[PDB]
């Protein structure tokens, strides 16, 4: 009787997985359409770099392409869960697909789900905050990295300069874990790129602790926090977002900044598409495994 | 005008061919099931003999 109940639960999970696979397929088709439109926009902008080419005609071209992008974003829905155009008021919206029905060893039953994140790189025109992958400005600088840090319980994105590991090790720096000390300056390895950090109690905003150190000979024992400040050498930002492109007399530098921002958005959108494809593959594998388990 | 009429009126025959094959298969299945439903009613004769 218990095994028959578990088999019925597994059948229900298989139906839910089929529904989730349909949703993922629809969202990924929308993502491919967005990729194509963004590539066309980037090609048009690159062609617009020529000074002799009039910019008005390209202006309504990009206007039509932006309307097409909006139509792609809003139309690509299956059952109200479009996995796009999410509300980023909290900034941590998460959607899940029923993956498998698991009965624990100690007489417990639970349902496992596969999570997908729509934080800031797979949202496609955030409805309210207007801080999505599109309709937002991208910082464009040579030697910086855009890092997300939570302050007072709310996350934010800050642009800070990044330093290569080769320069750090050539300058004669002493390392410890994810922390470095080249001298009068200190660095923490929050991500694959090294960044200058403040000692402690400087911001006084309850920022996330980047790393903790110890004596280590000549290393001060303190809880280090990534420096929210320390602007790059040349802090340049995209003139307009992807959804607000207006190339009427911008100039060469503005055109280059817009092109770089468009390319960054395209790269992020391609990463999101790859993630969606990986999710679809995982759903297919999970469905096949659930079928095998039900047969067994 | 002729191009517009063709676009509004003509049919992309490939999916019609696909539908034709699908309906042939569906009719074959329906005929087989209908024959089975005709045949299965004769089982009762075993009891009375």
């Amino acid at each position: 009787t218990t095994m028959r109940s578990d088999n019925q639960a597994l059948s229900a999970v298989q139906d839910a997985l089929g529904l989730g696979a349909a949703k993922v397929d629809t969202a990924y088709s929308g993502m491919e359409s967005a990729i194509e439109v963004v590539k066309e926009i980037k090609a048009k902008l690159v062609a617009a770099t020529e000074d002799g080419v009039d910019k008005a005609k390209i202006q309504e071209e990009i206007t039509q392409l932006k309307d097409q992008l909006t139509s792609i974003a809003d139309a690509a829905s299956f059952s109200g869960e479009n996995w796009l155009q999410a509300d980023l008021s909290g900034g941590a919206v998460t959607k899940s697909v029923v993956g498998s029905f698991v009965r624990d060893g100690s007489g417990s039953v639970a349902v496992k789900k596969v999570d997908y994140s729509l934080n800031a790189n797979s949202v496609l025109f955030d409805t309210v905050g207007d801080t999505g992958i599109l309709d937002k400005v991208y910082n464009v600088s040579q030697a910086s990295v855009t890092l997300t840090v939570n302050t007072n319980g709310v996350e934010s994105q800050h642009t800070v300069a990044a330093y290569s590991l080769e320069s750090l090790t050539e300058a004669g720096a002493e390392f410890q874990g994810n922390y470095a000390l080249q001298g009068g300056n200190s660095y923490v390895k929050v991500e694959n790129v090294w960044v200058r950090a403040e000692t402690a109690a400087t911001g006084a905003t309850g920022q996330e602790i980047a790393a903790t150190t110890t004596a280590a000979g000549t290393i001060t024992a303190d809880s280090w926090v990534v420096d929210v400040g320390n602007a790059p050498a040349a802090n340049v930002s995209a003139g307009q977002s992807v959804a607000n492109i207006n190339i009427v007399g911008m100039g060469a530098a503005a055109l280059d900044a817009l092109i770089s921002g468009v390319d960054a958005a395209l790269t992020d959108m391609t990463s999101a598409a790859a993630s969606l494809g990986s999710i679809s593959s995982r759903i297919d594998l999970q469905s096949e495994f659930v079928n095998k388990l039900s047969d067994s | 005008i002729e191009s517009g009429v063709g676009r509004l009126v003509d049919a992309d025959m490939n999916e019609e061919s696909t539908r034709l094959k699908a309906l042939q298969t569906q009719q074959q299945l329906a005929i087989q099931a209908l024959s089975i439903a005709n045949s299965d009613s004769q089982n009762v004769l075993s009891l009375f003999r």
Binding site: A48, D54, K57, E60, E61 | N14, T18, A22, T25, Q26
Partner: protein, 49 residues
């Protein structure tokens, strides 16, 4: 196996549609030259021409 749907046939249909559109574009291109033949092409180059 479902006789009501054919995913492979649907993918083939989409591919055939793409090939047909590209072939029609190239057929117009080879018939009339004019790589920028209409405003449906690059509008700025068409206006300059």
């Amino acid at each position: 196996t479902s006789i009501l749907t054919n995913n492979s046939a649907m993918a083939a249909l989409s591919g055939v549609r793409s090939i047909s559109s590209s072939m029609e574009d190239t057929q117009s291109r080879i018939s009339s030259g004019l790589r920028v033949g209409s405003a449906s092409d690059n509008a700025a180059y068409w206006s300059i021409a």
